[PDB]
Amino acid sequence: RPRFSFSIAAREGKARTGTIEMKRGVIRTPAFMPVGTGADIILGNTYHLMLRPGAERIAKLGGLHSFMGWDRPILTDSGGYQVKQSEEGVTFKSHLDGSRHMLSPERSIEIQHLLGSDIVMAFDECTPYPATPSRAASSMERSMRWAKRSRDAFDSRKEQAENAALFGIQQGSVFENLRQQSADALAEIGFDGYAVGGLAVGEGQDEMFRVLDFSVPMLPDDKPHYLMGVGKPDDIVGAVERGIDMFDCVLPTRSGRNGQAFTWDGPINIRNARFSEDLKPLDSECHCAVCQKWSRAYIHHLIRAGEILGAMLMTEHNIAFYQQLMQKIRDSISEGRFSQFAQDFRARYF
Amino acid sequence: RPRFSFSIAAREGKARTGTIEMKRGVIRTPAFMPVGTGADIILGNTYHLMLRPGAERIAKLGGLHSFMGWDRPILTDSGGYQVKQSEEGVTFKSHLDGSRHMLSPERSIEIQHLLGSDIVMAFDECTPYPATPSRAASSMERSMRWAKRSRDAFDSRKEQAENAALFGIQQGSVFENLRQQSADALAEIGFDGYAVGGLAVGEGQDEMFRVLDFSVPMLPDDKPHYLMGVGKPDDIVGAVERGIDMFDCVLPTRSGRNGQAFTWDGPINIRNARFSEDLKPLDSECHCAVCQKWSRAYIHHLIRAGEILGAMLMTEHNIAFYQQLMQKIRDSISEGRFSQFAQDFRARYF
Ligand SMILES: [Zn+2]
Ligand SMILES: [Zn+2]
């Protein structure tokens, strides 16, 4: 397969469906990328892995793919969002054993290289919400400078340039002129994919969607658009409606460990007593393995008993719900009925 | 299949291998019965289930088999070992919501009936270790009276008598005359199986084996012998050498949640730094699913990262190790080489 080939097979309104081809596999889009721990690609947390066991160590152990036994594509973040600051980058000391750490566009790239990622994220500067226009512009401009450094560092490592892909990240907070500036800088540098950054910060769906309505058409139409940190099922459906192709969110896993299950009728809190005698599966349309075999009542019980198996079935369910959702979105766009699906989705979910 | 048919296919010294046939399936012996949460039979905790969700409720929900989705045989304990005392039984208040509870040979039987167990344990009186001969004799005599009440209550419930089986429990602490007395009472009442009770109480392997050497031949040879609460891999091999056919122990699951893995080279503490870069699977001969796919180094990492998946792989590994051990014991006895296996087992395990 090629290093990277994005192809759009069908469209409806702003929504798109198609595929990304890479050496380690094909990624069907719109895509949900679960955390490392039906998916075509998963996410590696660079910041976490850098702290334990370390990037050198993971490289020594054969790379991330062999380490976690996953031989399909992997997307790593830059590590900075999770993180002594300056134009050069950032230095921090580890909480695990006080070791001193430095992150920069160059060092971030090097670390994702050591990890062996297939999709590398440029290193940028988080923009707090809310931000003044002044602060948003200053942060965005530094991010675009860091985007150029990331590109160069990526391109100077032959093995990465030839087998991996680089995404640039749009910043600019919620201001349209800054977003446009950011989009133009990014396209002038040129990347394999364009992420929309800065929108997973407590702004509320309304504002998120507003900023996506003008932000996504600024990005190159023939490249994948990645909405970082998003999100709930209804955020995904609305962002796909606005042109996003890729998503990641800790929601399924965390929800999975704190007793919450996603269903087509809305999220449910399975620890609630109203589920104690409910013989229906987690979700009635879910084709997932948990859903095949066990009832809400038994999972309620598991979790209530503090049994580990319960959180496990819950997480497995949630992960599978998210992939079925993306599958329903792909098929609906491909069939010219995504507009309908979305409306039916909401009526029932809410 | 019959209600209950125990058949001994082969012998070596005191060890036996064969099968138990019941309506819901065949149980190959010597057997390890894991907790509800390769096994031919599992264990239900009666005391726990009685407190949550309740026996009535589980019956309402279709019985334990349908509730946990397990359609093979299930053995339930009496509930008293986990537990206001008198010759009639015992009353206790729940810690979950202060509800008042009573246990007795009759009520224990009724509850295991409501749970739908295939193998029912008579209700007896735990004997603390150490015990004076006087106290051991008094506790044993009450247990044999309770054994007769359990038999009668079991026999007065047509559905149980016809589709389930009852085991009696030998008591008597570590005194041989009491054990013999207990064995004779039990055989005079008559049960489908005979458990050896009172030996999972911190006495140390030496004393356990000593008491098994004279206790097991007192039980009827043509019925299964169940060693309750035992145990570590090396306790099982030695108790099989002394004539036991059935075992249960929380070891695999708990060990599984507290970072400890069983291997043919002894238990390992996977959280230890010496495993951080170990690419070997949990155990090299283990055919288990974890062992297929993941390294000690990645499971070390999982657990160190607090990830739930890790404890899950560990427990799965431990459960599978125990079934492979029982399988190795069955085959070795059937082949006339159990004496050899046991010696080789120890050399490597220790
Ligand atoms: Zn499901
Ligand atoms: Zn294994």
Side-chain angles (χ1 to χ4, degrees), chain A residues 1-44 46-51 53-56 58-80 83 86-87 89-92 96 98-99 101 103-125 127-157 160-187 189-205 207-253 255-256 259-268 270-279 281-283 286 288-291 294-311 313-323 325-336 338-350, chain B residues 1-44 46-51 53-56 58-80 83 86-87 89-92 96 98-99 101 103-125 127-157 160-187 189-205 207-253 255-256 259-268 270-279 281-283 286 288-291 294-311 313-323 325-336 338-350:
Chain A
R1 256 175 325 247
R3 185 183 62 84
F4 188 88
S5 180
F6 178 50
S7 174
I8 293 170
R11 294 225 211 211
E12 196 187 322
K14 299 215 249 208
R16 317 94 74 73
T17 182
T19 52
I20 299 170
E21 265 163 79
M22 298 191 77
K23 297 195 152 97
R24 287 173 193 260
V26 173
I27 304 152
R28 310 165 278 176
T29 66
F32 185 79
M33 311 178 290
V35 342
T37 216
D40 293 323
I41 179 178
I42 62 197
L43 248 100
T46 296
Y47 171 74
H48 288 4
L49 292 167
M50 115 164 58
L51 297 202
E56 282 288 328
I58 274 172
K60 222 266 243 24
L61 262 14
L64 200 48
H65 296 79
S66 161
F67 180 63
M68 37 190 305
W70 175 268
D71 71 2
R72 291 197 114 195
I74 293 174
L75 193 146
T76 49
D77 53 44
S78 76
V83 212
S86 70
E87 183 67 28
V90 84
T91 69
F92 54 104
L96 299 186
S99 48
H101 296 93
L103 231 31
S104 62
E106 297 74 18
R107 192 23 192 190
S108 181
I109 287 326
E110 165 50 6
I111 281 152
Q112 303 178 68
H113 186 17
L114 283 174
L115 290 175
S117 191
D118 305 272
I119 305 195
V120 173
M121 297 302 301
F123 183 73
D124 66 348
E125 187 161 70
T127 306
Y129 180 84
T132 59
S134 174
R135 308 299 205 204
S138 292
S139 165
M140 183 274 287
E141 294 152 359
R142 167 176 278 165
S143 284
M144 298 297 100
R145 294 194 292 272
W146 286 1
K148 173 60 175 149
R149 290 167 62 188
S150 299
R151 178 38 103 178
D152 287 345
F154 178 95
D155 296 335
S156 76
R157 296 157 198 283
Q160 232 175 5
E162 295 194 6
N163 301 289
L166 230 216
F167 283 30
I169 300 169
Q170 187 200 220
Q171 295 281 4
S173 195
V174 296
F175 316 96
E176 178 173 28
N177 60 318
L178 261 23
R179 287 272 174 188
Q180 177 71 70
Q181 258 185 77
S182 186
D184 293 344
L186 252 28
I189 300 161
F191 293 87
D192 293 308
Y194 298 86
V196 179
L199 291 182
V201 293
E203 70 262 28
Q205 195 183 86
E207 255 276 279
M208 184 183 54
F209 285 173
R210 184 175 86 75
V211 173
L212 288 160
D213 296 336
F214 56 69
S215 294
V216 185
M218 308 170 170
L219 306 179
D221 174 90
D222 65 353
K223 282 144 166 18
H225 313 319
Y226 166 32
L227 183 56
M228 310 181 88
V230 180
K232 302 140 123 85
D234 47 316
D235 295 328
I236 300 195
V237 168
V240 163
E241 282 181 296
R242 297 171 169 76
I244 295 310
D245 312 302
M246 295 164 54
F247 303 84
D248 84 83
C249 197
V250 281
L251 259 202
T253 327
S255 282
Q260 198 190 50
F262 295 96
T263 79
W264 290 101
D265 301 281
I268 49 165
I270 205 68
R271 296 180 65 120
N272 190 289
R274 75 194 137 226
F275 294 114
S276 64
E277 275 166 10
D278 194 330
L279 276 180
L282 244 16
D283 179 279
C286 186
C288 104
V290 187
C291 277
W294 301 275
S295 65
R296 298 171 156 191
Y298 180 59
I299 301 151
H300 168 87
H301 176 65
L302 264 14
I303 298 293
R304 285 305 278 278
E307 235 350 289
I308 276 255
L309 205 101
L313 266 10
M314 286 282 288
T315 301
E316 156 152 25
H317 162 78
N318 282 343
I319 289 160
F321 176 83
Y322 267 68
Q323 291 310 314
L325 167 66
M326 306 315 297
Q327 183 57 59
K328 265 177 193 187
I329 293 170
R330 292 191 297 263
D331 290 351
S332 83
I333 296 148
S334 176
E335 296 186 6
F338 177 50
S339 184
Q340 194 59 73
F341 168 80
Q343 121 170 37
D344 300 342
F345 169 73
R346 271 137 199 168
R348 218 231 275 212
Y349 198 79
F350 299 125
Chain B
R1 256 175 325 247
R3 185 183 62 84
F4 188 88
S5 180
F6 178 50
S7 174
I8 293 170
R11 294 225 211 211
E12 196 187 322
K14 299 215 249 208
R16 317 94 74 73
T17 182
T19 52
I20 299 170
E21 265 163 79
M22 298 191 77
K23 297 195 152 97
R24 287 173 193 260
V26 173
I27 304 152
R28 310 165 278 176
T29 66
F32 185 79
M33 311 178 290
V35 342
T37 216
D40 293 323
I41 179 178
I42 62 197
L43 248 100
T46 296
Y47 171 74
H48 288 4
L49 292 167
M50 115 164 58
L51 297 202
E56 282 288 328
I58 274 172
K60 222 266 243 24
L61 262 14
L64 200 48
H65 296 79
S66 161
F67 180 63
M68 37 190 305
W70 175 268
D71 71 2
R72 291 197 114 195
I74 293 174
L75 193 146
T76 49
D77 53 44
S78 76
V83 212
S86 70
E87 183 67 28
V90 84
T91 69
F92 54 104
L96 299 186
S99 48
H101 296 93
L103 231 31
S104 62
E106 297 74 18
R107 192 23 192 190
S108 181
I109 287 326
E110 165 50 6
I111 281 152
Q112 303 178 68
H113 186 17
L114 283 174
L115 290 175
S117 191
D118 305 272
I119 305 195
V120 173
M121 297 302 301
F123 183 73
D124 66 348
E125 187 161 70
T127 306
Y129 180 84
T132 59
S134 174
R135 308 299 205 204
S138 292
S139 165
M140 183 274 287
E141 294 152 359
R142 167 176 278 165
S143 284
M144 298 297 100
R145 294 194 292 272
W146 286 1
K148 173 60 175 149
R149 290 167 62 188
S150 299
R151 178 38 103 178
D152 287 345
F154 178 95
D155 296 335
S156 76
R157 296 157 198 283
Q160 232 175 5
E162 295 194 6
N163 301 289
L166 230 216
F167 283 30
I169 300 169
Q170 187 200 220
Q171 295 281 4
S173 195
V174 296
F175 316 96
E176 178 173 28
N177 60 318
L178 261 23
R179 287 272 174 188
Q180 177 71 70
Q181 258 185 77
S182 186
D184 293 344
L186 252 28
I189 300 161
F191 293 87
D192 293 308
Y194 298 86
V196 179
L199 291 182
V201 293
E203 70 262 28
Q205 195 183 86
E207 255 276 279
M208 184 183 54
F209 285 173
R210 184 175 86 75
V211 173
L212 288 160
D213 296 336
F214 56 69
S215 294
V216 185
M218 308 170 170
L219 306 179
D221 174 90
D222 65 353
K223 282 144 166 18
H225 313 319
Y226 166 32
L227 183 56
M228 310 181 88
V230 180
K232 302 140 123 85
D234 47 316
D235 295 328
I236 300 195
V237 168
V240 163
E241 282 181 296
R242 297 171 169 76
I244 295 310
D245 312 302
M246 295 164 54
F247 303 84
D248 84 83
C249 197
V250 281
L251 259 202
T253 327
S255 282
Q260 198 190 50
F262 295 96
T263 79
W264 290 101
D265 301 281
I268 49 165
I270 205 68
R271 296 180 65 120
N272 190 289
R274 75 194 137 226
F275 294 114
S276 64
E277 275 166 10
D278 194 330
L279 276 180
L282 244 16
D283 179 279
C286 186
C288 104
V290 187
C291 277
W294 301 275
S295 65
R296 298 171 156 191
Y298 180 59
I299 301 151
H300 168 87
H301 176 65
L302 264 14
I303 298 293
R304 285 305 278 278
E307 235 350 289
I308 276 255
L309 205 101
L313 266 10
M314 286 282 288
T315 301
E316 156 152 25
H317 162 78
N318 282 343
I319 289 160
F321 176 83
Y322 267 68
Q323 291 310 314
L325 167 66
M326 306 315 297
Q327 183 57 59
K328 265 177 193 187
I329 293 170
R330 292 191 297 263
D331 290 351
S332 83
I333 296 148
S334 176
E335 296 186 6
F338 177 50
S339 184
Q340 194 59 73
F341 168 80
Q343 121 170 37
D344 300 342
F345 169 73
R346 271 137 199 168
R348 218 231 275 212
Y349 198 79
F350 299 125

